[PDB]
Amino acid sequence: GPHSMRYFETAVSRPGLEEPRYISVGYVDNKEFVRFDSDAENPRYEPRAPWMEQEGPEYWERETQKAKGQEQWFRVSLRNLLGYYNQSAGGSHTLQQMSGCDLGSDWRLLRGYLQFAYEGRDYIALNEDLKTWTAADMAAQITRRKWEQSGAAEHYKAYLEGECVEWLHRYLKNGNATLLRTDSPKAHVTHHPTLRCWALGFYPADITLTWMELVETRPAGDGTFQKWASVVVPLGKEQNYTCRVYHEGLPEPLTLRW
Amino acid sequence: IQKTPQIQVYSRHPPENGKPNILNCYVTQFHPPHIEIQMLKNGKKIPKVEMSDMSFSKDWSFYILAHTEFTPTETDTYACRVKHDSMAEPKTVYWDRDM
Amino acid sequence: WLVTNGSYL
């Protein structure tokens, strides 16, 4: 199947301050493996996954210095967006970035991604060709002209076909065991004045419950997830429905009733 | 513009009366990222409530998980209280133990 | 491995 790496970066300007808050989070196959946060007393890039402790000191020193450089880059770009949009530095503003790559079934680069959002809305994004930009509005068109003139797309396309694929290959080799894990859900059913099917303790988050109301899948905090789906039965007719749960951790899909 | 938070409040483990557990306030879909979350017991704030580390989603909206230990009883009520710029006043969400 | 950004916005 496919695989992916992503980095989610966030900068928030702080009025009357020079340094915005900068947070950077790494993801392999949508699982967080690294994080940096400018809020710490001595901020340092840190492993969020067991298999990342296999990397040595030069790794964490280098990623740390990179992150401080990115904090500066977002500080600049924030100042520029104030001008494009004629805003005041008296307000807090938010800039976000998603970058990384998807490897196909053949482990070759399938798709590269680089995109930015301002105030939580799409601003500019590098296209599938890793050559051209899509700008979201008139302000982003300024940036797009700038980046055309500077050839920034080349820098990114190099990274995406570069380091992104390499380091992803290596993060897959390192994280192999852990990343293949599946915890099967444990399920049960409750009656109310309304019957409810609970799936608890499962990983990864993709799951199907079928009898109806349902809640978005939620973290338990312990590395597993929870979901439930319910109906309103005809109050006298019990075994009103059967609850099936399909999840890739189950030897077979479960079946339950009240 | 700003996205108003969605809130779920639930225990990590199925609640038993008297048994040490963890209460979760899961807040999602919001923007800007700055947000303030509190946990309440019979209308009274709980100190020490730990924030998760904040992430954001594919659609750019922020999310986060607040959690603090708790010991459910038959009588005490629990709730989560969220202050965010998208709302003219903070939103409080009761803890329903079978929700 | 974190990408390093190019030209500023």
Residue numbers in the entry:
A (entry chain A): 1 to 193, 200 to 217, 228 to 274
B (entry chain B): 1 to 99
C (entry chain C): 1 to 9
Task: Please give the exact wording used by the authors of the publication that reports this structure.
Specific recognition and elimination of tumors and/or pathogen-infected cells by cytolytic CD8+ T lymphocytes (CTLs) critically relies on the presentation of antigenic peptides by MHC class I molecules (MHC-I) at the cell surface. The crystal structures of H-2Db in complex with the LCMV-derived peptides GP92 (CSANNSHHYI) and GP392 (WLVTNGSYL) were refined to 2.4 and 2.5 Å resolution, respectively. The overall structures of the complexes are very similar to each other and display the classical configuration for MHC-I/peptide complexes with both epitopes bound within the peptide binding cleft. In both complexes, the fifth peptide residue (asparagine p5N) and the C-terminal residue act as anchor positions, binding to the C- and F-pockets in H-2Db, respectively.
The nonameric GP392 binds to the peptide binding cleft in a classical elongated conformation. Similarly to GP92, GP392 utilizes residues p5N and p9L as main anchor residues. Residues p5N and p9L use approximately the same hydrogen bond pattern as GP92, besides two hydrogen bonds that are missing due to a shift in the main chain oxygen of residue p4N causing the distance to H155 and Y156 to increase. It should be noted that the leucine residue p9L is considered as a weaker anchor in the F-pocket, compared to strong anchors such as isoleucine or methionine, with a following reduction in hydrophobic interactions. In contrast to GP92, the crystal structure of H-2Db/GP392 indicates that the asparagine residue p5N that can be glycosylated is essential for peptide binding to H-2Db. Addition of the sugar not only disrupts the fork-like hydrogen bonds formed between p5N and the H-2Db residue Q97, but also transforms the glycosylated p5N position into a much larger residue unsuitable for binding into pocket C. Analysis of the crystal structure also reveals the presence on the bottom of the peptide-binding cleft of the negatively charged residue D9, which renders pocket C (also formed by residues Q70 and Q97) more acidic. Thus, pocket C is a perfect docking site for polar uncharged asparagine residues whereas modification to a negatively charged aspartate is unfavorable. However, the glycine residue at position 6 cannot act as an anchoring position substitute as in the complex of H-2Db with K2G, providing a possible explanation to its much weaker affinity to H-2Db, compared to GP392.
